[PDB]
Amino acid sequence: NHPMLMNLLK
Amino acid sequence: KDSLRPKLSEEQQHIIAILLDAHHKTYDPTYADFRDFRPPVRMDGSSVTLDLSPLSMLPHLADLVSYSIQKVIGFAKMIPGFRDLTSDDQIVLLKSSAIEVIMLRSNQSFTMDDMSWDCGSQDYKYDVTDVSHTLELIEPLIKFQVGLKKLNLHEEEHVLLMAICIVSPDRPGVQDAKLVEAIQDRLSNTLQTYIRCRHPPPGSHQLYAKMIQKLADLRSLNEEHSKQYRSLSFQPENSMKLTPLVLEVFG
Numbered sequence A: 001n002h003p004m005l006m007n008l009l010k
Numbered sequence B: 001k002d003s004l005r006p007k008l009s010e011e012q013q014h015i016i017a018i019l020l021d022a023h024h025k026t027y028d029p030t031y032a033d034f035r036d037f038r039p040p041v042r043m044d045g046s047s048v049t050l051d052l053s054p055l056s057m058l059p060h061l062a063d064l065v066s067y068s069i070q071k072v073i074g075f076a077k078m079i080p081g082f083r084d085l086t087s088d089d090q091i092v093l094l095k096s097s098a099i100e101v102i103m104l105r106s107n108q109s110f111t112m113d114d115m116s117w118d119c120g121s122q123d124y125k126y127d128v129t130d131v132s133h134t135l136e137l138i139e140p141l142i143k144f145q146v147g148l149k150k151l152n153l154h155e156e157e158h159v160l161l162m163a164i165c166i167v168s169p170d171r172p173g174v175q176d177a178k179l180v181e182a183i184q185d186r187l188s189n190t191l192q193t194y195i196r197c198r199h200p201p202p203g204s205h206q207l208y209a210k211m212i213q214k215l216a217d218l219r220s221l222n223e224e225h226s227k228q229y230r231s232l233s234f235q236p237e238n239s240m241k242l243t244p245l246v247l248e249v250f251g
Ligand SMILES: C=C1/C(=C\C=C2/CCC[C@]3(C)[C@@H]([C@H](C)C[C@H]4C[C@@](C)(O)C(=O)N4CCCCc4ccccc4)CC[C@@H]23)C[C@@H](O)C[C@@H]1O
Pocket: B054, B055, B056, B057, B058, B061, B062, B064, B065, B068, B102, B103, B105, B106, B107, B108, B109, B110, B117, B119, B126, B130, B131, B132, B134, B137, B225, B228, B229, B232, B250
């Protein structure tokens, strides 16, 4: 449930 | 027996070069991006008199924090070893340390001439009045920034402290604490060896112990920021003024 933070770590 | 003289190893010199470079790419000391934020509002629109709404600075500071979260993430990804972690541990480390790294890194713009964060112009100079029952957070915060500014850290020490902050193995939700601890140990030894070999006396006296105390001070500010944030974000009129990234990270 952290899609934006997860996207920034890609 | 002469092998006990501290010497900064080649890997330790690479770690410093990477953290310096990562911070130079993620912290713009000209603050040019601040123009993209929702404008700061201190004067009444009718602008020789002050605006009396206590949340008039919220759109601007919310955009500033949200932007700074992006830069902290960008810097953390360059921390040697951070990418060996699972994506869950990375998320747990950033969620926990984001507001602490923001307060650490803000010390670059903080000035003791008038105890404000000065980002190149008076539009982007933030004092206590702007950040303003938020004094529960702001008075400690300012005492913290003064104490940190007085340590007179080399840029090398400064970025190392930011990286040691992010990679804390005791953060809640961390799964692989042994791996996180090994990454932090490599950074801690770098900083301790850096101070002993590169930081001349007298400023280097007890410096590492003082820096670790600032990490301890940050925990208390983190909890304090958490209480203020949960009471602010509860009112829908105020959370409308937030950004999706801040809501996800701080919620
Ligand atoms: C963030 C940085 C900089 C400064 C950081 C500052 C100075 C301004 C005030 C900052 C952003 C603090 C925030 C306001 C904390 C804010 C941001 C927020 C929304 O996360 C929160 O809950 N806060 C504390 C509750 C305050 C509620 C309130 C807000 C506005 C007006 C009235 C009441 C936290 C760190 C401080 C400048 C530069 O060095 C870049 C750096 O990354």
